[PDB]
Design a binder for this molecule. Structure first.
Ligand SMILES: Cc1cc2nc3c(=O)[nH]c(=O)nc-3n(C[C@H](O)[C@H](O)[C@H](O)COP(=O)(O)OP(=O)(O)OC[C@H]3O[C@@H](n4cnc5c(N)ncnc54)[C@H](O)[C@@H]3O)c2cc1C
Length: 225
């Protein structure tokens, strides 16, 4: 129970969740497949942003470079004492009966948390259409490992198809948890115990929406603890 909350995905929703939880002293483990992609935008994030959010703090009105936004956001997360940001590729759910206690990782070492949050964005069943090529990636140059979706599918989880687009321009078709799997008020993926989901992998929205959702989840978990 080292981590009170284990979050899979250091993107706009997952990192925001980690941010507010850490501000309150919650022991958070933020697991993400690529540290070089932490909080990486598609198009440059532009105001307005949720007040006091990690998203707002990471913004620089004089620097629109998306990679720089990623770097500034990553650095901000690394400054939170109760937060441990680490690299690992989640490949499946660690279960004890009907309870999710963590995730298996491709590299081998399992990661555990009292509560497990999936904030994997557009990386489930991702297909990136760029010109005359189709890549298995949730965002430009960011590969998507098929394992997690396969595990969730094997366990019985239902998904719906969604699509996002970047004005080279490209489109990303991905899978989001079917609405019936998710309890909006608690962020619970009710099919199993101790499992939560937030962000694009459960509901559409832009950067600010992802951030607001992450904060809302953090506030809910703080109440539950
Ligand atoms: C093609 C496309 C373009 C978009 N463009 C914009 C835009 O220009 N402006 C805007 O406001 N919104 C845009 N959106 C909507 C939304 O704001 C973004 O998708 C945003 O990144 C969603 O936040 P998220 O936290 O759900 O996912 P992300 O920010 O994508 O973060 C997901 C994280 O999870 C990690 N991850 C995934 N699977 C695993 C795994 N198995 N193990 C470990 N880590 C994993 C990823 O590597 C990543 O770091 C776009 C959406 C799409 C699909």
């Amino acid at each position: 129970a080292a981590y009170q909350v284990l979050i899979v995905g250091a993107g706009f929703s997952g990192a925001e969740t980690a941010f507010w939880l850490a501000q309150k002293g919650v022991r958070v483990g933020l697991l993400t497949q690529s540290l070089d992609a932490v909080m990486m935008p598609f198009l440059p994030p532009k105001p307005p942003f949720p007040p006091g959010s990690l998203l707002e703090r990471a913004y620089d009105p004089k620097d629109e470079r998306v990679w720089a936004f990623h770097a500034r956001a990553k650095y901000l997360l690394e400054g939170l004492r109760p937060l441990h940001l680490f690299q690992a590729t989640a490949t499946g759910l660690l279960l004890e009966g009907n309870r999710v206690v963590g995730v298996r990782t491709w590299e081998g070492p399992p990661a555990r948390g009292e509560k497990v949050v999936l904030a994997v964005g557009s990386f489930l069943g991702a297909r990136l259409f760029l010109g005359g090529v189709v890549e298995e990636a949730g965002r430009l140059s960011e590969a998507s490992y098929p394992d997690l979706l396969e595990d969730l599918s094997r366990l019985g989880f239902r998904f719906v198809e969604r699509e996002g687009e970047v004005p080279p321009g490209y489109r990303v078709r991905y899978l989001a948890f079917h609405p019936e799997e998710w309890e909006e008020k608690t962020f619970r993926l009710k099919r199993l115990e101790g499992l939560y989901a937030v962000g694009l992998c459960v509901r559409e929205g832009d950067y600010a929406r992802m951030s607001e959702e992450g904060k809302r989840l953090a506030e809910h978990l703080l109440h539950e603890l």
